[PDB]
Amino acid sequence: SLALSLTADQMVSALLDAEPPILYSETRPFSEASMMGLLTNLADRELVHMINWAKRVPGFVDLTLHDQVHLLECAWLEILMIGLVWRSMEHPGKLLFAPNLLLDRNQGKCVEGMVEIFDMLLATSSRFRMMNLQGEEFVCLKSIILLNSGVYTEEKDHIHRVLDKITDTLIHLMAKAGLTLQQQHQRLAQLLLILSHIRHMSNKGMEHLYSMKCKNVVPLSDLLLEMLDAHRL
């Protein structure tokens, strides 16, 4: 409710101030188990900050507890991936999982099936680079993923009105940058079409983690297993 009565500049600063911190990973050459362990540990700790970031997303606290759980269960990997892609913008050809964990696609071969997901993530980062994605636009996209990804699986009218609010915020940011009317809706479309690929990467990444849960190569955390089990029922 209060998210609707709020201005475009106040939307940006609220999202910026809610940004989670950049966490560190815990030197020895990588193997299947070691690299999967570092990524599992890092993702498990990032999830804790994402949950507190979600509660600070305007309009998210207005939702019921079950609806908050559903949205996070559906979008958690998407949100991790778009943040990873965002961190890796200033590192072409590399993925900055953590400041002390910068990886290229050759290191992605240390885990089977990891290469294909690495190449997709690296492609999205280069797309953000080519578009010169600003941080104000990034926090809008990430909050859109949170509210949209699980919206089709009225409390939904609220989510859609909040989604319209973020669209107004994105357009407001592009008008402040000097873009014309045609350049505004074109860039709006280009940004939102990337969310389709982010969803595709998450689905491929979701399949890959389920394989490692069955292959039992590295013990996953209970929270990470609960998030993973939500994508089957």
Binding site: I51, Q68, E73, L223
Partner: peptide
Amino acid sequence: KILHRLLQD
């Protein structure tokens, strides 16, 4: 139900 607990805090 870890996710529920983390959203309460």
